[PDB]
Structure 1
């Protein structure tokens, strides 16, 4: 699918965007392309703490329920409430308007463990090739 360079990725197909002292999380284009039409998004509550590797919400498609794992840890400060109304933004704008949450990174260096665009692309290739 389509990959962007200014982001750090997770094997479970989530992306992060570091900007000063905040991280914007969402799911990649490869993810939505594989999920199919997204029909519902269940996001966490503000103030709640997310943990690296643990699920914070879920995305439902016409076929299934896909739990989204937080790529890093932090406190949720913001949530895209527009997704409840327009779940489709995930399919149409995964990297921009399809943003799910905004967190205060509690352990910033966790971003080092995160893959880059090229690293992720190779990854997506390997996973697609295992079929």
Structure 2
């Protein structure tokens, strides 16, 4: 529910640092629970520059459209095209096949302010 090794955001997203320095981003187990079954996702353009807090993707459930926010500032270097065909991966694999996009972070101070597994568990605890 909260993989030990990921970093987390307050908008209920995780970030996994990759070998090449980029970050894979998705929504957490908590977030997908609250969304319910996903039926479409609208992904950003590869190459888009975002600021932390920009609404840059949309998860659509049977009930509602729900905005997904950039957790850090940077450039979108990849998006998860499997989601066009299998959007339910966001629900069944929110830390695995349900990843949403990958980002080249442009600001180290944002990265240093993201929650570790423990500090995320405590944001739920609340």
Shorter-chain TM-score bucket reads: over 0.9
After superposition, the C-alpha distances for 1:25-75 in whole angstroms (9 at most, x for unaligned) are: 110011111111111101100111121122110111122111111111111
Aligned pairs for 1:1-131 (under 5 A) are 2-19=1-18, 20-126=20-126
What TM-score, normalized to structure 2? 0.94
Q: CA RMSD in A?
A: 1.1
Deviation at 1:82, TM superposition (A): 0.9
CA distance in 2, matches of 1:35, 1:43: 16
SS of residue paired to 1:24 = strand
Q: In the alignment, what sits opposite 1:129?
A: none
CA distance in 2, matches of 1:119, 1:86: 31
Mind listing any 5+ residue stretches in structure 2 that lack a counterpart?
Answer: none
CA change 1:125–1:63 in 2 (3 A) is farther
Work out the number of aligned pairs and report it: 125
Mind listing any 5+ residue stretches in structure 1 that lack a counterpart?
Answer: 127-131
